[PDB]
Paper text:
The asymmetric unit of Apo-PSD1 contains two αβ-heterodimers, whereas that of Apo-PSD2 contains four. The N-terminal pyruvoyl residue (Pvl-254) of the α-subunit was unambiguously identified in both apo structures. Gly-253 of the β subunit, which is no longer connected to Pvl-254 after auto-cleavage, is approximately 12.6 Å apart when the distance between two Cαs is measured, and it forms a salt bridge with the side chain of Arg-221. Consequently, Pvl-254, which is located at the base of the funnel-shaped active site, is open for substrate binding.
Phosphatidylethanolamine (PE), a major component of the cellular membrane across all domains of life, is synthesized exclusively by membrane-anchored phosphatidylserine decarboxylase (PSD) in most bacteria. This maturation step results in the post-translational modification of the N-terminus serine to pyruvoyl in the α-subunit, which is an indispensable prosthetic group for decarboxylation activity.
Numbering used by the authors:
A (entry chain A): 8 to 253
B (entry chain C): 14 to 253
C (entry chain B): 254 to 292
D (entry chain D): 254 to 287
Write the structure that this text describes.
Amino acid sequence: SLQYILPKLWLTRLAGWGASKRAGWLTKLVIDLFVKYYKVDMKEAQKPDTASYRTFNEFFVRPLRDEVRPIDTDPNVLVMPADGVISQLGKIEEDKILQAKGHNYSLEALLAGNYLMADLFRNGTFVTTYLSPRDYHRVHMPCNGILREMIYVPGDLFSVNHLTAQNVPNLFARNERVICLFDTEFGPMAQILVGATIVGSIETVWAGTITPPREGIIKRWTWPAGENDGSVALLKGQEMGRFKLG
Amino acid sequence: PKLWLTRLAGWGASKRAGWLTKLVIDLFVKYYKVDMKEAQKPDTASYRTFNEFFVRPLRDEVRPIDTDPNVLVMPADGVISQLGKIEEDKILQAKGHNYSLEALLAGNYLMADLFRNGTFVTTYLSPRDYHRVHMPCNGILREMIYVPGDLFSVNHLTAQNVPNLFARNERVICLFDTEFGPMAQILVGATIVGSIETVWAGTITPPREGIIKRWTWPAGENDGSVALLKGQEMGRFKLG
Amino acid sequence: XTVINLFAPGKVNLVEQLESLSVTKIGQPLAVSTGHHHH
Amino acid sequence: XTVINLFAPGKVNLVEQLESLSVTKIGQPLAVST
C-alpha cells in the first residue's frame, strides 16, 4: 500500500480544483468515462443527460428522482441514510466497534475523545455504510430528528474500501469527519460523515461546506432542543449532507 | 515532508554510532552554544546516542526549587513565548494570532471551562536548552490526553505566521489537582523534536496511531493515585 | 466515503437479514424501534 | 518544543517581571498564589 507514501492531501486538492472547473467538453468527457468505468445508473438521476452538469462535482453530488427512493412511512422503522453497501453493523461491545475481522476501534476514538457522547452509545448499536464511487453521494436522515451538536474532526485522508478497512487500524477514527448528534423518538442518534482521499469535502444542509478549508482544529457547534426558537428539525428521508471532491 | 524527516532524525538520533554520534553531538554543541558545564556528564563522549545527549540530565545543585509553598516555579529551561490573562477563551500566540482554549484542549469543553478567564504561560525550549519538563507545584495527576496533530516547526518565525500552531501540532495535555485549583501542563511537539514522554507512562509518541487517547487517575485520597512534587521531572522531548 | 450511525442501548433492532456487503438504498428499512409508535 | 500551562481564574498572579523572550530556569519563580 502507497497509503502511507502518497501525499493524499495534495491529490485531494488537485481533484477538488479539477472537479470545480466548468470545462464543457473535458467535463462531459471525464463524467462520461466515469459513468462507463463505474457503471452509474443515470436512469435514477433527476437529469440523466451527462451534458446537464456544469462541473464534475455538480454530477458527483447529482440529485435522484424522488420516486426511485421511496421512504418507509412506518414511524417504528428507521431507514437507511445512504446508497451503497453495509461494511459492518451490530452491537457496540461496551466501547468496541467492529471495523473488519480482527480490527476493533474505540467508540471514544471515533468521537474524538468525547467521553460524554461516547457514554450515550456504550452497548448500543452501530451501522457503517460504504458509498462506492458509482453510488449517490448525498446522505439522508434515518428518522425525524432535532440537530443538537455537530463536531468537525481534523484527520488523515486514507482511502475507504474493503482493502483499507481490512488493513488500516482505526481508519474511521483517524480520517477527517463530521459528527452530527440528534434527539429522536429513539433517544440520541449519531450520524457521522467520514471523508476519504479525493472525496474529502463534507457538507450539511444547515451549514454548507464544513471542509475544505482544513484549519486543523476540532470545531463544535450546538443547537437547542426542538421546543426552543432557532432549533433545526429534519424529517425521515430528508437530505442532511453530502460528499464531493476536494 | 515533516513526518518522514522526523522519523529519519529519530532513526538517526537512536543509533549508537560512536565517532559519528560524538561528531554530530560536537557540531550541535558548537552551533547552538550548549552550556555542558550544567550537564551531569560534561564529556560529549559519555553519550551512547544523540538522543541520550538531547535528553541529558543536569547537575543536582544547578536548578534550585523555590521553597515558598505559595510560589509556583518555572517547569522548563528556555524563554517565555507569551503569558498573561486568558481573555475568555482567547490565548495570545503572537502579534495578530489568537487561539482557542477549546482548540488547544482538543474540543474538551469541560476542561476548557475550568481555565476560562484564567492564566497561561507558553515556554519555548530552544535546541541548546535542557529538554526535560518539571512540575511547577505539587499535584495529583487526574487526566492525560494524547492529541494527534501536524509537526509544524515551533519558533518565533512560525509562532508569528502559522495560525493555531499549538492547537494543531501533536501534543500531550496533563491535568493535575493542586493547592491552586486545576492546573494543565501541555507538551507540544514539533518537526524533528516530535517524541513526548511522561515519567508515569514512558514514550507517548511515537508511535503515531492517529487517534485521541484519554487516561484518567483518581483523586489523591484514593488507592492507585499518582502524586508529583514541585520541581520533580514529569516528562521530556526527544527526536523521533 | 462512509456514514456511521450510533443508536443508544436497547432502542432499535437492526433488520436481521442485513449483513456485511448487503446493498443499501435510501428509504429501505435499517432498524425497527423496540418501543411501539402509531399513525 | 514548547510547554503551555493553564491556571484557574483568580488563583495565581504571574511575577510581573516576566515578558515575551524572558529567560526561564526550572526553580525560578513563575507565579504567586492569591
